Amino acid sequence: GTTKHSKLLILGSGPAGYTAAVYAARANLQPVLITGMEKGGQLTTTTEVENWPGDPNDLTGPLLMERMHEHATKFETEIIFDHINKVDLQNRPFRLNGDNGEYTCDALIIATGASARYLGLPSEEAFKGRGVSACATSDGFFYRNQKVAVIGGGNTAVEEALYLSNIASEVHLIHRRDGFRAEKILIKRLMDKVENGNIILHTNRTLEEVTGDQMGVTGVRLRDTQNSDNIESLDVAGLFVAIGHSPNTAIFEGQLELENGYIKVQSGIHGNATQTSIPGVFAAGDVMDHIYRQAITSAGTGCMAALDAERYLDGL
Amino acid sequence: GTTKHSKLLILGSGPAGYTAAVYAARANLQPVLITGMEKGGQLTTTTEVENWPGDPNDLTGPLLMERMHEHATKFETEIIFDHINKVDLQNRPFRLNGDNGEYTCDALIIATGASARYLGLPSEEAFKGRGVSACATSDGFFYRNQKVAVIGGGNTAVEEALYLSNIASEVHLIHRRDGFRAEKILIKRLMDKVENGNIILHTNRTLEEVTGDQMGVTGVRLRDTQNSDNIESLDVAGLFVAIGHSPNTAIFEGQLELENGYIKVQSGIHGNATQTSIPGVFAAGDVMDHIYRQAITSAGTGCMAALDAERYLDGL
Numbered sequence: 001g002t003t004k005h006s007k008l009l010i011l012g013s014g015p016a017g018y019t020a021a022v023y024a025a026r027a028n029l030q031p032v033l034i035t036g037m038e039k040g041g042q043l044t045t046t047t048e049v050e051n052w053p054g055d056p057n058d059l060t061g062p063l064l065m066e067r068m069h070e071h072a073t074k075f076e077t078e079i080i081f082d083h084i085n086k087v088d089l090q091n092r093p094f095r096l097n098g099d100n101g102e103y104t105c106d107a108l109i110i111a112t113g114a115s116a117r118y119l120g121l122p123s124e125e126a127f128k129g130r131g132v133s134a135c136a137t138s139d140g141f142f143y144r145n146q147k148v149a150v151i152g153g154g155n156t157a158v159e160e161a162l163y164l165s166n167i168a169s170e171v172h173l174i175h176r177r178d179g180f181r182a183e184k185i186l187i188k189r190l191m192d193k194v195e196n197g198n199i200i201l202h203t204n205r206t207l208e209e210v211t212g213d214q215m216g217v218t219g220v221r222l223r224d225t226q227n228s229d230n231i232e233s234l235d236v237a238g239l240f241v242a243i244g245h246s247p248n249t250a251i252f253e254g255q256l257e258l259e260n261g262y263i264k265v266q267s268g269i270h271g272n273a274t275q276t277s278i279p280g281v282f283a284a285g286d287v288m289d290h291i292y293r294q295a296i297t298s299a300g301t302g303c304m305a306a307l308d309a310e311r312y313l314d315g316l
Numbered sequence: 317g318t319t320k321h322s323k324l325l326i327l328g329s330g331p332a333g334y335t336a337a338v339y340a341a342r343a344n345l346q347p348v349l350i351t352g353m354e355k356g357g358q359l360t361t362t363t364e365v366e367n368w369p370g371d372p373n374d375l376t377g378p379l380l381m382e383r384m385h386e387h388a389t390k391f392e393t394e395i396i397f398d399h400i401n402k403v404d405l406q407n408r409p410f411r412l413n414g415d416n417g418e419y420t421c422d423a424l425i426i427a428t429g430a431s432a433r434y435l436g437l438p439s440e441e442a443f444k445g446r447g448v449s450a451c452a453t454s455d456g457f458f459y460r461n462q463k464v465a466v467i468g469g470g471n472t473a474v475e476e477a478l479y480l481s482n483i484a485s486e487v488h489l490i491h492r493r494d495g496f497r498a499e500k501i502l503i504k505r506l507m508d509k510v511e512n513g514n515i516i517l518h519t520n521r522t523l524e525e526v527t528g529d530q531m532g533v534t535g536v537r538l539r540d541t542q543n544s545d546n547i548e549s550l551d552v553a554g555l556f557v558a559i560g561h562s563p564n565t566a567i568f569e570g571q572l573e574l575e576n577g578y579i580k581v582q583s584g585i586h587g588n589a590t591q592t593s594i595p596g597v598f599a600a601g602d603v604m605d606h607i608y609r610q611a612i613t614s615a616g617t618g619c620m621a622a623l624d625a626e627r628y629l630d631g632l
């Protein structure tokens with residue numbers, strides 16, 4: 001087994017990992033980046049992106065990530081295709097174990113993301129990128145003045161429904177239970193939009209099937225109530241499955257301070273804002289952000305992490 | 317005199333203001349953006365940009381900003397060419413007075429930047445974008461393994477010198493006084509690089525002239541010492557004038573909490589991170605960031621500000 005030492009190691013090949021790589025390479029730090037299993041991150045699972053600033057037309061998630069990969073390799077970032085399964089952050093240098101070897105480093109940037117879960121239905125899988133989506137902030141504007149459905153019961157779903165009711169003609173919130181398990185302020189605003197507006201509630205329903213045509217989604221079939229099998233049918237142009245994200249942080253449990261699985265950073269306006277609870281370990285992207293979750297905020301913290309890492313490595 | 321009300325008003329047409337505009341427009345908020353006098357921000361004063369992620373080749377600051385302008389107008393952002401001279405943020409709606417009218421709004425995003433100062437020399441003005449620069453993080457990699465000069469005595473200059481000594485073969489720090497007025501940790505690391513390395517000190521000198529050829533800077537002439545007129549000459553490929561930035565916040569004094577002229581935001585990992593001391597007023601870009609100062613971090617906080625503004629406007 002091999003053991004490669006690097007001054008700076010970056011975990012993840014999403015927008016945060018690639019931006020941290022171009023900033024680290026241009027700081028002459030010679031970064032090594034480990035891609036993980038999903039080479040290019042969550043953006044490779046989507047079709048059109050029209051909120052990456054400065055790219056008004058013709059951008060897709062795959063094309064953005066190919067450009068970011070080109071950018072990192074232009075400045076000679078060593079890119080390694082591997083995935084980390086064990087970590088030891090309590091001894092110096094930090095040791096990380098992959099499938100293809102052992103890695104040690106003096107500074108670490110963690111940009112392992114927070115992947116969206118789906119329902120697992122074949123009909124849902126069929127319409128991904130053509131009507132079924134997992135990000136309302138990104139894709140909500142394509143369904144402006146149209147009917148939309150959101151499925152879920154926690155915080156994300158009530159937030160997605162609330163955000164979407166300002167864009168769509170109406171929002172259909174679908175949930176298995178007869179009650180939402182979201183924050184008190186979210187549920188208050190939800191019930192105001194149910195009563196005086198835009199959101200139609202469909203509690204005690206489960207999604208059976210996503211129907212549609214050649215261009216995409218046209219409807220949704222629901223079933224059940226509290227004791228019965230009624231089977232509803234909704235005419236809808238888009239579906240937003242909002243059942244939660246999975247921050248890829250299991251490997252860091254007991255090593256780093258986490259908050260609902262998200263890596264806690266120092267934050268603040270006085271620098272060293274991406275530093276985790278361990279000196280020399282920094283986090284960027286969706287793994288440390290459960291509020292905004294965009295490629296542009298992930299690239300922004302990717303940049304901050306590389307400059308924090310540079311300042312750490314130089315004794316400041 | 318006219319008084320135009322807008323639900324959301326954005327101040328500034330740099331990367332933070334334009335990204336907040338595309339996120340606000342795609343949230344169906346119908347943003348109005350006031351450009352200020354410098355239409356396109358600080359990036360219009362630079363030549364090549366090769367740290368905007370996903371753009372490996374052929375980007376210049378003017379081209380990025382033209383693309384961001386196209387992006388904002390594609391989503392029907394109302395762009396107004398005006399500059400704000402007076403503000404009243406203590407009454408609702410917020411009132412802002414420009415040269416071309418009065419504006420009121422329910423939520424405000426301030427993205428007015430922090431402009432770099434220069435020495436005012438004709439020879440320096442002659443070589444801007446071709447050897448004279450004000451951002452070491454951005455432009456430092458172009459002078460890799462070459463001789464570089466930095467001029468200044470505060471925090472920025474010692475930081476720029478320290479950052480540049482890892483890229484350049486040697487750094488020549490030029491200062492009027494016989495001592496630097498930077499942080500204790502910065503001066504410690506500085507004196508270590510002076511003694512065991514890369515940084516050559518030139519205290520009690522003032523820059524007289526920046527010389528160069530058709531392609532750019534080739535030298536620098538200094539003069540004086542503590543009582544005498546010796547006149548030095550340095551062979552150098554780049555000059556970094558690091559004499560300070562000017563956050564455009566005079567209009568907000570006594571209205572908002574400032575910290576060395578920078579707008580203080582809430583920050584943190586629990587949302588509403590761009591909110592200033594006044595509810596409903598948010599800040600983004602270099603006006604609230606004195607540490608990273610990049611177009612990508614400005615676009616990231618621009619995005620955060622628009623989503624914070626959306627959540628505020630919807631009672632969350």
Ligand SMILES: Cc1cc2nc3c(=O)[nH]c(=O)nc-3n(C[C@H](O)[C@H](O)[C@H](O)COP(=O)(O)OP(=O)(O)OC[C@H]3O[C@@H](n4cnc5c(N)ncnc54)[C@H](O)[C@@H]3O)c2cc1C
Pocket residue numbers: 011012013014015016017034035036037038039040041042043045046048049050051052082083084085111112113114115116133134135138139248251284285286287293294295296298
């Ligand atoms: C359906 C959908 C559409 C979206 N559309 C948009 C859009 O239009 N615009 C937008 O702004 N945002 C969009 N987003 C959000 C965007 O995808 C994420 O914000 C962004 O990808 C997060 O960047 P990241 O670098 O933090 O993580 P990710 O892109 O999630 O990348 C994480 C990386 O870490 C690696 N990794 C994980 N575990 C390990 C490990 N143990 N060892 C090593 N590497 C590991 C992975 O392989 C991957 O490369 C969308 C999201 C979804 C799900």
Ligand SMILES: Cc1cc2nc3c(=O)[nH]c(=O)nc-3n(C[C@H](O)[C@H](O)[C@H](O)COP(=O)(O)OP(=O)(O)OC[C@H]3O[C@@H](n4cnc5c(N)ncnc54)[C@H](O)[C@@H]3O)c2cc1C
Pocket residue numbers: 327328329330331332333350351352353354355356357358359361362364365366367368398399400401427428429430431432449450451454455564567600601602603609610611612614
């Ligand atoms: C020489 C140089 C080169 C640089 N190169 C790079 C680079 O290669 N890459 C990089 O990442 N960064 C670079 N930067 C840094 C980058 O320019 C800034 O980080 C970025 O422009 C800040 O964005 P912003 O939107 O916060 O503010 P700015 O771009 O500074 O824009 C501020 C806006 O606010 C407006 N405004 C000001 N006052 C008022 C008012 N009272 N009313 C209304 N509007 C007002 C202005 O007109 C302007 O449109 C460089 C900076 C300099 C100086």
Ligand SMILES: NC(=O)c1ccc[n+]([C@@H]2O[C@H](COP(=O)([O-])OP(=O)(O)OC[C@H]3O[C@@H](n4cnc5c(N)ncnc54)[C@H](OP(=O)(O)O)[C@@H]3O)[C@@H](O)[C@H]2O)c1
Pocket residue numbers: 119151152153154155156157159174175176177181206207242243244245259260261290291
């Ligand atoms: N603090 C905040 O403001 C905030 C905001 C956004 C995100 N976050 C973070 O992001 C994480 C994930 O967001 P979340 O809370 O929405 O995820 P979550 O905690 O998993 O809640 C989503 C819920 O959707 C329901 N569901 C699952 N499968 C379903 C199906 N087939 N049909 C219908 N309903 C189904 C489940 O609730 P039931 O068991 O009730 O059915 C599930 O728990 C959070 O845990 C948090 O860390 C926090």
Ligand SMILES: NC(=O)c1ccc[n+]([C@@H]2O[C@H](COP(=O)([O-])OP(=O)(O)OC[C@H]3O[C@@H](n4cnc5c(N)ncnc54)[C@H](OP(=O)(O)O)[C@@H]3O)[C@@H](O)[C@H]2O)c1
Pocket residue numbers: 435467468469470471472473475490491492493497522523558559560561575576577606607
């Ligand atoms: N907290 C931090 O870590 C940090 C870091 C970066 C930036 N910042 C922020 O950014 C602001 C600006 O940075 P700064 O401190 O460098 O600016 P500054 O406070 O203006 O200091 C720069 C100094 O350069 C000197 N100078 C001016 N003209 C010169 C010339 N012609 N030749 C040589 N020297 C000349 C002056 O010092 P003399 O009077 O001594 O000659 C001047 O005060 C700060 O005030 C702060 O708000 C803070």
